[PDB]
Amino acid sequence: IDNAVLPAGSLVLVTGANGFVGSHVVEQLLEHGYKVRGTARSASKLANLQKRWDAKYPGRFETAVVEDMLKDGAYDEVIKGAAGVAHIASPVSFSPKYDEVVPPAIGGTLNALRAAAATPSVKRFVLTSSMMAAIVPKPNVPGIYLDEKSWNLESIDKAVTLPESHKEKGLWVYAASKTMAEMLAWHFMDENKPHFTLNTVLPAYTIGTIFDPETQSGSTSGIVMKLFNGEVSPMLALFGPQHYVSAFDIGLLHLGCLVLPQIERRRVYGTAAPFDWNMVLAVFRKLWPSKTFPADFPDQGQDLSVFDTRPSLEILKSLGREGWRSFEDSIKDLVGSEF
Amino acid sequence: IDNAVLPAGSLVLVTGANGFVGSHVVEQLLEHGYKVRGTARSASKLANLQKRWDAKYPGRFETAVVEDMLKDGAYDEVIKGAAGVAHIASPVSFSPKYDEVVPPAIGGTLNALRAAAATPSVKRFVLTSSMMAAIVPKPNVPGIYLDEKSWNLESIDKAVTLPESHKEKGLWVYAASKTMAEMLAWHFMDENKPHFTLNTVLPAYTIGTIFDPETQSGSTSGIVMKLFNGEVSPMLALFGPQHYVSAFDIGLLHLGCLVLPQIERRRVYGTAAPFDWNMVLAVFRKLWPSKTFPADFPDQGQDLSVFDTRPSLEILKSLGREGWRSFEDSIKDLVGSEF
Numbered sequence A, B: 001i002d003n004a005v006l007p008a009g010s011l012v013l014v015t016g017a018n019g020f021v022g023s024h025v026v027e028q029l030l031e032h033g034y035k036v037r038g039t040a041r042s043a044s045k046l047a048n049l050q051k052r053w054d055a056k057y058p059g060r061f062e063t064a065v066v067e068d069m070l071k072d073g074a075y076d077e078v079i080k081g082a083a084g085v086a087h088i089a090s091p092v093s094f095s096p097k098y099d100e101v102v103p104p105a106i107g108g109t110l111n112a113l114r115a116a117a118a119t120p121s122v123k124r125f126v127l128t129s130s131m132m133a134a135i136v137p138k139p140n141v142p143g144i145y146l147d148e149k150s151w152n153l154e155s156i157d158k159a160v161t162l163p164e165s166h167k168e169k170g171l172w173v174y175a176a177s178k179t180m181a182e183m184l185a186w187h188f189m190d191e192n193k194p195h196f197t198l199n200t201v202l203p204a205y206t207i208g209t210i211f212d213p214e215t216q217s218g219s220t221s222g223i224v225m226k227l228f229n230g231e232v233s234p235m236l237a238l239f240g241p242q243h244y245v246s247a248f249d250i251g252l253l254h255l256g257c258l259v260l261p262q263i264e265r266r267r268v269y270g271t272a273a274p275f276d277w278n279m280v281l282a283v284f285r286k287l288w289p290s291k292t293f294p295a296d297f298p299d300q301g302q303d304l305s306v307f308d309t310r311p312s313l314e315i316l317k318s319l320g321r322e323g324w325r326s327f328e329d330s331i332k333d334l335v336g337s338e339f
């Protein structure tokens, strides 16, 4: 990569490397010549991915353990030697228990930033936020435009005021955890003025290859894979209308945030285009014409939101892409094709 | 009051009227010729204050009951006929249990704002926030200036990340509850554009008369009264050097926010000057030479924070005052003098 601000072969700390998005961020860092120390809550959580990366990128990936992101100094040992940090770990269980989701989301973010601020080698930091840190869209509302000043303050209300029993409690607790963790990351930069540059990535519903189906749920792509196998996840209905994005493109957006000089202090939307669950089923039938799939769901509208993707497309074009990877190619990365 | 936006004799709904700050807001509204409907979770919580106000301002105060301010429509009956609303009720127990403090603070605020938005007679709404929605000051830190753009983002971190066992957990939980409730109040105005104007009051440590010591703890002034009687409250150690304000002045600031035409969309600091507990004890010894008082506490130094009090002083001057009521007079309002 020309003009890369982290020299070739530099070490990047990636937190939550056993997770779905984290494994794609690790993959693209390794693919572009960087060494990676990936954290997980246990060595066994990364065992299969370590075997994959040892075979594909020999001697470039290393496992590191961080069991609790809330303990003080959680990342103080794993940060040593790193030129960049990608903080991707956060609770995505959709648990309705506020105290189980919001404190690790905020605590992990701030412990990672504090470790980076105390480590002179760290020059760049990328935080995985979410499109939900800006908005949880409603069906068919024209004229909504989201940009780097958009914040989901509605989620702060709903995460605390909805009863624990509400069917959407977990979704709103999750959105508030992302909103507050990202707000506090930018405030940390303003207050402490550390010697590294921050960028954030805000993915939409991420679709792509599950590298290790044996010990990776696959998050959003695991829900899609369950539907491919005829299982309607209870979590599927706990989602409103929205945009998709390729997991491969999300890997590239984090890489660009870590190494491109023209991307500084940005909130990078990973939002390719709207989609619905009947478009997913239509692509399954096209890719696997012999297979039986669930019947179409009722029409659940469309997300008409428009995002300021200028830095997102600047990153993809600087890293050799023509634009966003298509919805059909993103689903094919996950479920393949019959022929 | 000349040029008042709420005509003379208008009705103002005051939530949490049995509380310390709420009873002073009710007192100054009644003193300036407005009718007040004050709410409490039971009629007995307001019985003694109702007796006071019936004797001092006959036929001007009405008790109203709002048992639960978190549920939907909680303020739907008490809002009828109101030209102004002062929302004062919020948890001030300093409990370290986040889920017992933050949800009623946010939920009560938003439920009052939604009731006001649905009621065309409501022209003004004043929310009691806190100086802690901007900052929890650290000792002897120079150059900190708080203005209408200051927000206590540090409290959002500490309220969730500190363990429940931390000595300051309750203080940070309380500061976050004020910070989030007031942020969501301004967001509500921006999102819904209702036909009323919001102003907020951010008091410092409020000192003044406890009107009904039999059924009012007196909050901050109750801690001062315990110290006057020789008792060091366990909560006193949570209040280090910080600013004080007269309870009488806080009553006037809410009155100005409800009725002065020149105060709109403002965050009004109720911050008179720094104080420390040794200054409180020195005033006690001066006012009561025959009583013994506790020895001085360890000199923790002073709060050096400076607040933008330009709208606060505009309100006090418009309501006939020269400026802030002094520290010695505020303490004398609570404990009197020996002769």
Ligand SMILES: NC(=O)c1ccc[n+]([C@@H]2O[C@H](COP(=O)([O-])OP(=O)(O)OC[C@H]3O[C@@H](n4cnc5c(N)ncnc54)[C@H](OP(=O)(O)O)[C@@H]3O)[C@@H](O)[C@H]2O)c1
Pocket: A015, A016, A017, A018, A019, A020, A021, A022, A040, A041, A042, A045, A066, A067, A068, A069, A088, A089, A090, A091, A092, A104, A128, A129, A130, A131, A178, A202, A203, A204, A205, A206, A207, A217, A218, A219, A220, A221
């Ligand atoms: N998938 C999407 O479409 C999408 C969209 C927007 C943003 N994101 C963000 O992407 C990041 C990764 O999520 P994902 O979708 O890849 O889900 P995932 O596969 O469940 O990965 C989540 C990662 O976070 C770790 N983690 C969760 N709770 C933790 C805790 N309490 N302490 C330490 N580590 C913890 C998990 O480790 P364990 O295995 O040990 O639990 C895992 O490594 C999150 O920040 C998420 O908000 C994802």
Ligand SMILES: NC(=O)c1ccc[n+]([C@@H]2O[C@H](COP(=O)([O-])OP(=O)(O)OC[C@H]3O[C@@H](n4cnc5c(N)ncnc54)[C@H](OP(=O)(O)O)[C@@H]3O)[C@@H](O)[C@H]2O)c1
Pocket: B015, B016, B017, B018, B019, B020, B021, B022, B040, B041, B042, B045, B068, B069, B088, B089, B090, B091, B092, B104, B128, B129, B130, B131, B178, B202, B203, B204, B205, B206, B207, B217, B218, B219, B220, B221
């Ligand atoms: N005193 C100060 O120095 C100071 C400084 C800054 C801001 N404030 C603000 O002033 C307001 C009043 O507090 P205060 O100092 O006057 O304390 P207070 O004397 O204890 O009064 C608190 C009031 O809030 C009500 N309340 C508390 N939790 C409630 C709940 N869950 N549901 C309904 N009502 C509830 C109380 O009613 P119950 O008796 O029914 O519990 C009472 O009316 C609060 O918003 C506080 O943050 C006070």
Ligand SMILES: [K+]
Pocket: A024, A027, A028, A247, A248, A251
């Ligand atoms: K990839």
Ligand SMILES: [K+]
Pocket: B024, B025, B027, B028, B247, B248, B251
């Ligand atoms: K008063």
